[PDB]
Amino acid sequence: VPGPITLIEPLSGNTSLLIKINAIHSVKKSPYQEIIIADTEDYGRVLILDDYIQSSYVDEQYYHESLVHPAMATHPNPRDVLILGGGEGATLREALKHGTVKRAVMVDIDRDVVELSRAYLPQMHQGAFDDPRAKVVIQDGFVYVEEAIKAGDKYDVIIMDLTDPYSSDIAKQLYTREFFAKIRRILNDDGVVVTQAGNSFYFPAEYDMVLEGVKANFPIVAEYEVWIPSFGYAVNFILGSLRYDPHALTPSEVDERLRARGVKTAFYTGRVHLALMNMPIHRKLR
Amino acid sequence: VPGPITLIEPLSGNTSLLIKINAIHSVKKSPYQEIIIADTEDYGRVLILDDYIQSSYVDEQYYHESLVHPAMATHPNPRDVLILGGGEGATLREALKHGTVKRAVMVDIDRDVVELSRAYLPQMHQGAFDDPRAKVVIQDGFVYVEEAIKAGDKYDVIIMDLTDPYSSDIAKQLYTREFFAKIRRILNDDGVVVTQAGNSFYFPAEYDMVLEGVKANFPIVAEYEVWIPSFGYAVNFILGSLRYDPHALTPSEVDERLRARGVKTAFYTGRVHLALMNMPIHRKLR
Amino acid sequence: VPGPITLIEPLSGNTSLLIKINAIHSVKKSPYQEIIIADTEDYGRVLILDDYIQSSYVDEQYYHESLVHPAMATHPNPRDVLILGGGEGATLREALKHGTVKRAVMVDIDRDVVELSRAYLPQMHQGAFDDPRAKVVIQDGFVYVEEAIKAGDKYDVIIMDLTDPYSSDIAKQLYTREFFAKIRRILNDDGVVVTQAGNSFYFPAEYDMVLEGVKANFPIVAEYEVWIPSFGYAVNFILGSLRYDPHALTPSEVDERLRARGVKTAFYTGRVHLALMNMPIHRKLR
Amino acid sequence: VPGPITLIEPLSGNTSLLIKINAIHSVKKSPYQEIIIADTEDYGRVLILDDYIQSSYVDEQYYHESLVHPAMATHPNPRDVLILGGGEGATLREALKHGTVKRAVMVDIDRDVVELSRAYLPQMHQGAFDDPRAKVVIQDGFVYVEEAIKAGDKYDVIIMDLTDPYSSDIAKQLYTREFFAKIRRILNDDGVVVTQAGNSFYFPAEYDMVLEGVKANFPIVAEYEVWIPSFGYAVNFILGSLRYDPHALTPSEVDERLRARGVKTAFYTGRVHLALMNMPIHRKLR
């Protein structure tokens, strides 16, 4: 039973997780957030920001593969990729696997998350930060997107891997209808956006606000979720597309794009893609 | 932060859930298990057996529909149904929705679970216990199956809705290779068995033992899982079939059987079926 | 870890107690406070007010005997006794044991605490509420003392058994310098006051405020403490005397007063009295 | 709730403490026990062995002074002192304050406790380990006492500061009748033994076993307790004496021995001694 040293991970406010801690690797009060890197018995090494597990060694591939590959596989030739957040470098790692990618930009507000992840979470980034195709920019993603509009920059796929919409003051401006309109302005005509949107079961109001924002700006929208044990819930993803429908890809087409692009995964396959496109998201039923 | 009255729900031993309790309706130490019916803020009313949530008002339909309908929809004409466990009566409720069912027998070892569920959990059974097609038998499922073999009783679908294989002494004899051989002897030649098998991520050894038991006795075996928030995990299900392959059903075939049989659901559909058949089960990836 | 049903009892705010609950007897939102009467495995039946255990079956006699008998034994002939609080009736029970007592008045603000204690905590009051010498008044103790001054009422011993000074808004006016001045005005010239004063170790600032209030109004002040397991701390008592010094009583004199007055106890004796007068109170030493 | 990083300190099994951790300094799985040195908000720096707090910066002086000084002050000229356990070096620190002491031997089974205490808990040992009068021996205390009998060694005062009798497999042989007989064989004819004996309230059976073991071997036995906040209980001590009765010492005699011997304390005085000798130990009263 889960001690003697325990993380109390908030889940809903009326439910919390008690997680056995084996070791604390680093604690850093950054100007933006409290960072903890720790070893958990169940999940191995974790990044914690303001008390919330962001990623674990034993299940981060479920999160990062589900966040990245459906969007990347839906785009027929994703060359220019923008990531907002993704501080541990695993979102960048998954995006770079696509041989079509020539330029991947990752924008995180917090240099301490990136530097502490570089040192203490090598199985997350796996060298992604040092890939010649990758540029790591330390900036508020809101400001970065405003400056990208003025420069008329355009991307094929935009991946939002931010802190939770229901908890995170630093990410709140990037989850609005108005921000999704700004995202559309820096997408090519066949562009795709994907974002994590917290949890539809425990935080339906915050989830619905994000969903309405994407639906108001993109004509094709897929909603899918994946159980991440270390989070205590099935994370919700919202994918917005200007041309291509992720629901239209067959397992064979997904598997052929992965093979052609040199993409190796622990989890994501054509069959996973089909399941994600067909499983409705969880809500409270009474 | 949950309290002042809290349920400490074990999950893995290295992770536990802290769940705020609004009221305790009943506590009963039966000879078989400790029974608690309580109101939780997140999940509404719950049945707890030996500290483990069995079912909640807000998400039990995810559990009971996922346990019952894939097996029932795979059988082309399920007339005789046997349920082992299912004390709250929701498994019986779901099976009875199939208009093909003429006889449903439910066998639970613990009369106190059934009677406390009848009184305190009416939204679970919804009158299923009193359906003219239903017989509720209080007996050890092991004993009932031995007596069914000697009587040469035979069923189209057998549903095992027992306490967890990783925790429950009272159910341990019903999760063995030898017990699945006994189940095959009370199935018709085109019969199907489904059982909950705990959790593949947190309890892989106990999950694998159940899987090997089913694979040794049945030529067609499907594995699928669904996130149940009140459990803290995606419950694993194992379906054993003598003739019909659930992987072969299309969404349209599932939806046509549901329509023809008068089956109304909150969750299960042809698309859910397709997703369950295509989503690999969770394991620790590192 | 204690469960599955647990009380999270706040202790210091940086430490809390997890207490196994076997049953909840009553929950009542009164106009003043939330009341819970519950069975704990370690402490048996408890009264809880706003999350704080007030008393337990297994250790309340340590609390009530330590609160009452040192003051009562110090007064050479206590005839008129006033109790502020003491909702469960055990303070009254201990005071009434003194054969010198002719009139005991108990004043609690909360009729629900008294009535629920009468019904659900009979081993606390043990009939004290119905003793012909006893008068139970439902009133704010602040108002009762103002009206006692105007009537020129006077008492030999005043016992304050209120909710904690560090947590309880309803009692806060009764813990001030100004309130102890009002108490002195309704004491005879040889009168004694005793109050519980929370805990000197975990709540030194609130303890010190009560102590300065008593020292400003009374020339003789004794401080003593007793470990109450169900509280998670040694409760602090402050005794204010106008004439008689509890430090001057010998074990033999205490034991003779108890014998002469027909006082039977589970804990308090002359030797206990000597120990209480000689044990310094706990503080943080670093 | 105290968090996000928490120590779950077992107390009774039906009560546990949740203690906020500010930092973890060191974690060592020794062959004998799990060792944690941590900073707590309430208690400052702590040593934890197998989940149990052994000592805290804010209250260890209550524990170590109460364990050592009553026995040392009862002996009229304690020259040779043996300590079994006392890994953090505070028991040794208190014993060495007595100017009569020429030789103090401290025997702990676990070199990791001693070395981690030397480095991370300097306010506990305060250089005691390096005092010319002190010998620190890493050995099982059982073996050390058997070898002391064979060498015919004799001591004036033996202090047992071991892990708890109710929890600690490594110490269990040192808490038996037979072990107290071995202790008597290495005492001078006016010798005194003192041991911590867990807690009489929460662990009465284990406490009573230790008490019967001492009473079978020593004609004078004193029982006393002190509240240690960081433990969640009043630790019980049992003192066994061959000639001198600690109940016979007056405050003045104790204070004169402390003054003559150059003993400076934060807590222990003649009045404390009197209180310890007069306070009965806590038991469940219903």
Ligand SMILES: CSC[C@H]1O[C@@H](n2cnc3c(N)ncnc32)[C@H](O)[C@@H]1O
């Ligand atoms: C750990 S993956 C989540 C990341 O979101 C990042 N993040 C939060 N808010 C913003 C923002 N406004 N702009 C960019 N990155 C952000 C955090 O710094 C964290 O590393």
Ligand SMILES: CSC[C@H]1O[C@@H](n2cnc3c(N)ncnc32)[C@H](O)[C@@H]1O
């Ligand atoms: C609440 S659903 C799980 C049910 O499994 C039941 N159960 C456990 N073991 C057996 C068994 N051996 N035979 C029948 N029912 C059982 C329990 O009594 C519970 O009601």
Ligand SMILES: CSC[C@H]1O[C@@H](n2cnc3c(N)ncnc32)[C@H](O)[C@@H]1O
């Ligand atoms: C349970 S024993 C302590 C009692 O103090 C009572 N109490 C708190 N505030 C006041 C007050 N202002 N006057 C009288 N009783 C009070 C509470 O109702 C409780 O029953």
Ligand SMILES: CSC[C@H]1O[C@@H](n2cnc3c(N)ncnc32)[C@H](O)[C@@H]1O
């Ligand atoms: C922390 S103070 C208690 C000490 O008792 C020690 N201890 C436990 N069992 C024995 C034993 N059998 N012999 C010597 N020391 C022991 C532990 O190593 C610990 O440092």
Ligand SMILES: NCCCCNCCCNCCCN
């Ligand atoms: N939950 C209560 C913690 C109990 C810890 N027991 C005290 C151990 C005494 N021996 C070592 C004390 C430090 N020298």
